[PDB]
Amino acid sequence: GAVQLHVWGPAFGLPSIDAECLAAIAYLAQTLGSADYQLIQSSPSAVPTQHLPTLYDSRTSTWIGGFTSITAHLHTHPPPTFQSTAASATADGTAYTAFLSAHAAPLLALSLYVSSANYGAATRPAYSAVLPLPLPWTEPPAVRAAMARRAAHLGLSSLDADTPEQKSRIRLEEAAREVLDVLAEVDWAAGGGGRQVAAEVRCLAFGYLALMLLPDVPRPWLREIMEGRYPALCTFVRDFRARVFPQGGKLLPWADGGAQASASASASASAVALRFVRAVMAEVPLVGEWWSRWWTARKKREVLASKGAKPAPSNDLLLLLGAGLGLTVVGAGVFFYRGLPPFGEAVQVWR
Amino acid sequence: ILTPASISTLEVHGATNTRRSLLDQIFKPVLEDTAAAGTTLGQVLDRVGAATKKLARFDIFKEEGFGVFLSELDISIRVKEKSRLVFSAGTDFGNAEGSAYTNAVVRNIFGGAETLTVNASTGTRTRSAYNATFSTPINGNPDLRLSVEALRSATQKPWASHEEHLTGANLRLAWLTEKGDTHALAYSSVWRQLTGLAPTASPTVRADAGDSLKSSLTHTFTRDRRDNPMLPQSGYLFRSVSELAGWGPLNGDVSFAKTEVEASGALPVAIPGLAGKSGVSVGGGLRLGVLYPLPLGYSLTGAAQPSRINDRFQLGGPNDVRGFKIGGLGPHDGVDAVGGDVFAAGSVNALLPLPRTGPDSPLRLQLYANAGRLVALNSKGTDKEGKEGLAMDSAAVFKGVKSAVGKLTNGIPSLAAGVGLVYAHPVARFELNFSLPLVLRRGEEGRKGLQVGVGISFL
Amino acid sequence: IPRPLQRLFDYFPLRIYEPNELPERSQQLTSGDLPTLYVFSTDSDARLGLPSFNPGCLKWQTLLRLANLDFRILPSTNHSSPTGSLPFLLPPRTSPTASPAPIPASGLLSFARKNPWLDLGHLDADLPPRAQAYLALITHSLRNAWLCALYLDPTHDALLRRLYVDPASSSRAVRAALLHQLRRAAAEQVATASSGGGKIVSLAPVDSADGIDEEAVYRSARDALDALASLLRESETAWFFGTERPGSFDAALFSYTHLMVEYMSEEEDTESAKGRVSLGRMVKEAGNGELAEHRERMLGVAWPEWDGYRR
Ligand SMILES: CC(C)[C@@H](C)/C=C/[C@@H](C)[C@H]1CC[C@H]2C3=CC=C4C[C@@H](O)CC[C@]4(C)[C@H]3CC[C@]12C
Ligand SMILES: CC(C)[C@@H](C)/C=C/[C@@H](C)[C@H]1CC[C@H]2C3=CC=C4C[C@@H](O)CC[C@]4(C)[C@H]3CC[C@]12C
Ligand SMILES: CC(C)[C@@H](C)/C=C/[C@@H](C)[C@H]1CC[C@H]2C3=CC=C4C[C@@H](O)CC[C@]4(C)[C@H]3CC[C@]12C
Ligand SMILES: CC(C)[C@@H](C)/C=C/[C@@H](C)[C@H]1CC[C@H]2C3=CC=C4C[C@@H](O)CC[C@]4(C)[C@H]3CC[C@]12C
Ligand SMILES: CC(C)[C@@H](C)/C=C/[C@@H](C)[C@H]1CC[C@H]2C3=CC=C4C[C@@H](O)CC[C@]4(C)[C@H]3CC[C@]12C
Ligand SMILES: CC(C)[C@@H](C)/C=C/[C@@H](C)[C@H]1CC[C@H]2C3=CC=C4C[C@@H](O)CC[C@]4(C)[C@H]3CC[C@]12C
Ligand SMILES: CC(C)[C@@H](C)/C=C/[C@@H](C)[C@H]1CC[C@H]2C3=CC=C4C[C@@H](O)CC[C@]4(C)[C@H]3CC[C@]12C
Ligand SMILES: CC(C)[C@@H](C)/C=C/[C@@H](C)[C@H]1CC[C@H]2C3=CC=C4C[C@@H](O)CC[C@]4(C)[C@H]3CC[C@]12C
Ligand SMILES: CC(C)[C@@H](C)/C=C/[C@@H](C)[C@H]1CC[C@H]2C3=CC=C4C[C@@H](O)CC[C@]4(C)[C@H]3CC[C@]12C
Ligand SMILES: CC(C)[C@@H](C)/C=C/[C@@H](C)[C@H]1CC[C@H]2C3=CC=C4C[C@@H](O)CC[C@]4(C)[C@H]3CC[C@]12C
Ligand SMILES: CC(C)[C@@H](C)/C=C\[C@@H](C)[C@H]1CC[C@H]2C3=CC=C4C[C@@H](O)CC[C@]4(C)[C@H]3CC[C@]12C
Ligand SMILES: CC(C)[C@@H](C)/C=C\[C@@H](C)[C@H]1CC[C@H]2C3=CC=C4C[C@@H](O)CC[C@]4(C)[C@H]3CC[C@]12C
């Protein structure tokens, strides 16, 4: 276990429920050895990077967040057992990597998160099945809200995601066609013909595409469009899953010999309570906005310190002293205003 | 009555929260009045009654139970204090547009008549209005009052197809003279922001959209000699509002010297056949205003920026020259109602009582002949504008104001006449009239149908 | 009731005068003989029609200059926009008191086609499926780098204050509020970017520089610039996709490369101490300098008269 990848729990018959986390798992399986890495089921509040997937390089005790950063870090610091128009292929991979993170992600949000009918039947139960008991009431609301903001520019809403229906389906088909048309040219199957992309881009493409096809949903508009109009992309996803992730990725080196047992390492009674209360604190009006910002900056320094940098110390001591002064003046005012004799008397006499 | 008998020792009930210093500054001169010892009941009995109203001005005591007792010559006065908190979370009627008013009030803080009123409002034409005010008398004088107010409101301007966001603080020094006038010197530093432009917004509104700060020192003088402010049937009213912004020590994005006056009056007429109060009166009104651009600095000579839509005057409406849409007078860019720099509005009405109804009733019939003008300053008079625009020298501004004032005299002013009924409700005046525009300029909006107006100020 | 009243209501008013003249400020700005494109610029720059410092406004300004349309530019703010954001176009007044409806950014190309000064198909032609992927390198990878460096980076604090908050108001209090809002807004966008954001902290979006990975944003821009240089190297012409004239793709890239060289090209002394290459230097060093020549060629077509574009 040279490195440990913190990802979401398995769902929909896939090793992870997140497109980026699933891509990171696929990249490690093909390149890294079986015993070199470990998969740990986690949540954004469990890792100091506040982002999933997150890699913890135990060799240097470094926290790396994001799929692009994880792949870049591995190339610069290859593990002992690592096996990853030449410039055109590299340039194409960069272009499609940015395209997937910018246009494929909002499309996936509409099918799973923005659609209230779809979210409440498949996505929401899946998230609760991979979290300790008090968390599904705080984390999925945050994930859905962030994912809904990603698909905000798409222009569609929950009502559209399913005569009102005579053009509602047209917008859904048009939005899916724009994203899927670009991806169909790449020919991710690595067969004869078509463009050629790096291994990292192929893993990222599968992560987004698998979450639009495999999940069984009450409103499978995306699955019908993908199968009906793009058989080549549907074939690629099934073939990739059947090889990289047989029987739903049960041979992956999950920590503690299981997907759910892996999360128990950082899901103790105290740790879970601390994660839950922090989420509640951020919702307190006019103070959460300030607690989360303080907490985000505190965790940012922790990640930067792990990377080898030397962040400047903060002024937390000054705020602590300043907070104490605020209590003293408030307490003095209460002690003075309350408990003092009345300013005037009931009977006032002048000679 | 004429018997000399000094009051000497006196005692006041119900002063358990107000400091003795507040009462000492009010009742000590009453004691010194008894030193004359000549016709006391003709001189000190009126003095206590005169000074009784001084206590009611602090608003700390309940005016309902303001009883006064008599004895021998000790004088006992019994008063009751108001509630220390009054969360008057209610709506508004007279100010119908006033929508709701969750006015919370902390009264009598620190013993003196201090008051922290944290009002909050939300309704039509005003998305939100949060006001925090702290008022306190100076040197124990109820007439002289000092107030510090912080506000953050987002008003709406449908006539100009935009909304204004206000954020600033004010420092007011209100004063009531012995004659009855009300001086008020206030310093304001607000941050105006024009946002929420309508799709039909004129280019003038778009050009003026943005952020600006106004640091101004304004003085208000009011002399209300009318018998009834809601239904003026006798007396007169003179109000003058002068504001200086951005000049000298005041720093801001706007620099001007705005002055607005207003003179009203009413003359009762008596029917020879009828006896007593006939109820028929003939009134009038006249409002003037000048907006003079000024440079930024301590010099009166220099380049001055033209006025913006935030500061320009707006004329027309039920509280303005009637017969026209709200802001229906002055320059109009397309459909938006841009403001003007100078204006002059007049009114000639005649209140009449309805038949078979006593004159004491608030209901009256009014026939008005409201008229007004509103022009905007421009640099057409100057020979040639420099390369860097929006910068008029002292000569150009002075010539522009003279031309603007001269535009008022030539040509018939925008005139509308009509009849209607007026309700003199004490909180606010309600008026419903049938108007008919007679003379107006092209692009101005006049209403020929029924017009409903409610408020405290009318022309 | 309506019919008897209508025959009398048209009698009034009796006298109608000419409309009142508009204010001086309105008469000096809104009056003109050419369509005015409102962009983020300075008073001196707008006089010569120099490129705007806003990448969003520069993209549309460049396209209008490639469409031979005769127009002028005037500095403005996002509040005056018909869509809530610049740029936008106001056609010249037909009457001193009446003006046509404003043209939004989306309709800019349609307006330029109706007022020749033609065949503007290349300026708005649909891109091939492969070219759509490379477009995401500009609208997402390069945009986040510009937003992070201009707003979140304390190094460009003086530039950000001078470009945006200084002309807004002279009040030191309002300027501070505006700076806070600008940085908070930029942080929300750079956060909706799997390149360097994606952190989940609460039910509200991340609006601070501490919730954004600067290294990931910087690395994505460096990869994007190399990829875009390779794509241009494939073309046999001086433009993308082997076109004889610049199109929408070139204007989209020029709106970022020009501003990076003009403003973000700092001195090597600061970069050496910081250990990070500036945005302007990466543009010149991308590939074999292909992106540097493209910016100069794009300037030499849309702004042939300008000669102070070095930095
Ligand atoms: C949301 C606010 C009101 C906070 C303060 C309230 C928290 C309480 C009510 C919640 C938070 C965590 C919850 C909790 C966590 C885990 C379990 C284990 C389960 O086998 C029995 C219920 C139990 C014990 C529940 C009971 C209700 C608890 C204790
Ligand atoms: C006993 C277990 C098995 C389950 C059924 C019980 C759940 C109840 C009793 C408790 C457990 C967790 C609690 C819970 C968690 C978190 C929040 C978020 C907070 O902002 C509102 C209250 C809310 C939503 C509370 C409500 C009460 C819940 C839902
Ligand atoms: C004695 C404890 C350690 C045992 C019962 C452990 C309980 C577990 C299930 C944890 C999981 C979530 C925890 C939890 C969630 C949130 C809160 C709200 C806080 O305001 C009081 C504690 C409380 C209620 C704690 C108590 C301990 C809980 C319920
Ligand atoms: C009667 C005494 C007490 C003295 C002091 C009061 C005088 C004032 C209140 C009276 C005297 C003459 C009145 C007067 C005369 C003529 C007119 C013209 C009319 O179109 C409007 C009202 C107006 C302007 C009224 C207003 C009220 C005035 C000015
Ligand atoms: C609006 C700007 C120009 C500010 C500075 C206004 C200043 C003038 C108009 C104000 C400032 C102080 C005021 C002032 C001070 C004191 C008194 C004594 C009182 O018995 C009569 C009024 C009088 C004389 C008033 C008149 C109006 C004055 C002179
Ligand atoms: C239609 C408008 C023009 C009407 C309301 C006019 C109002 C003004 C002109 C009236 C209102 C109050 C009047 C006023 C009040 C009191 C007095 C005292 C008296 O000893 C001399 C006249 C004098 C000074 C008059 C002059 C005229 C005034 C100032
Ligand atoms: C008090 C006695 C001794 C004498 C002098 C007073 C006479 C009054 C009735 C006279 C004196 C000045 C007159 C006066 C002055 C100016 C104007 C302004 C004009 O637009 C309306 C009439 C009005 C308002 C008249 C009304 C009648 C007034 C007020
Ligand atoms: C503001 C109030 C007082 C209302 C009544 C306004 C009245 C004034 C402005 C009106 C009333 C009568 C009008 C009047 C009567 C008759 C004529 C003859 C015409 O060939 C030129 C205009 C002229 C001279 C106009 C000018 C405007 C006047 C003088
Ligand atoms: C430049 C030279 C040639 C001459 C014409 C200019 C003189 C200036 C300095 C004078 C002329 C008119 C004056 C002027 C007119 C009117 C007012 C309104 C008043 O409430 C405040 C002062 C103010 C604003 C003054 C300020 C000084 C001005 C502007
Ligand atoms: C002031 C009261 C007592 C009464 C008499 C006034 C009535 C007003 C409404 C009447 C009287 C004279 C009328 C008047 C006179 C002359 C003209 C010239 C004409 O080309 C336009 C209408 C106009 C301007 C009208 C408008 C309405 C006026 C001004
Ligand atoms: C120190 C205490 C007294 C401070 C933090 C105030 C309140 C405490 C009790 C906390 C505990 C649970 C919090 C709480 C739970 C859930 C929600 C739902 C959310 O949609 C609005 C805020 C709200 C309603 C917050 C408000 C603040 C509460 C009620
Ligand atoms: C408060 C104001 C708006 C009231 C009193 C109305 C009018 C005032 C301004 C007076 C002042 C000068 C007057 C005036 C001057 C000269 C003429 C030229 C003549 O051929 C028509 C009437 C006309 C145009 C009149 C109309 C009434 C005017 C415009």
Author numbering:
A (entry chain C): 1 to 84, 104 to 181, 233 to 421
B (entry chain B): 40 to 111, 126 to 512
C (entry chain A): 16 to 132, 140 to 333
Task: Copy out sentences from the published article reporting this entry, exactly as the authors wrote them.
The folding and insertion of β-barrel proteins into the mitochondrial outer membrane is facilitated by the sorting and assembly machinery (SAM) complex. The SAM complex is composed of three subunits: β-barrel Sam50 embedded in the OMM, and two cytosolically associated subunits Sam35 and Sam37. The seam where the first and last β-strands of the Sam50 or BamA β-barrel meet is called the lateral gate. Unlike other β-barrel proteins in which the seam stays statically closed, the lateral gate of Sam50 and BamA is flexible and required to open for function.
Ultimately two different monomeric SAM complex structures could be distinguished at 2.8 Å resolution, from the same sample. The first structure contained Sam50 with a closed lateral gate (201, 630 particles), now referred to as SAMcl, as observed in previously published structures. Additionally, slight differences in the POTRA domain conformation are observed, with the SAMcl POTRA domain slightly shifted away from the Sam50 β-barrel lumen and the SAMop POTRA domain slightly shifted underneath the barrel lumen. The zipped closed conformation has a few hydrogen bonds, which distinguishes it from the SAMop and SAMcl conformations that have no hydrogen bonds. The accessory subunits in the open and closed structures are highly similar with Sam35 and Sam37 superimposing with C-alpha RMSDs of 0.33 Å and 0.47 Å, respectively. The lipid densities in both SAMop and SAMcl maps are at the same positions, suggesting that these are preferred binding sites for lipid. A TtSam50cl structure (light blue) viewed from the side and top shows a closed, kidney bean-shaped β-barrel. The presence of both closed and open Sam50 lateral gate populations in our cryo-EM dataset suggests that the SAM complex samples both conformations in the absence of substrate.
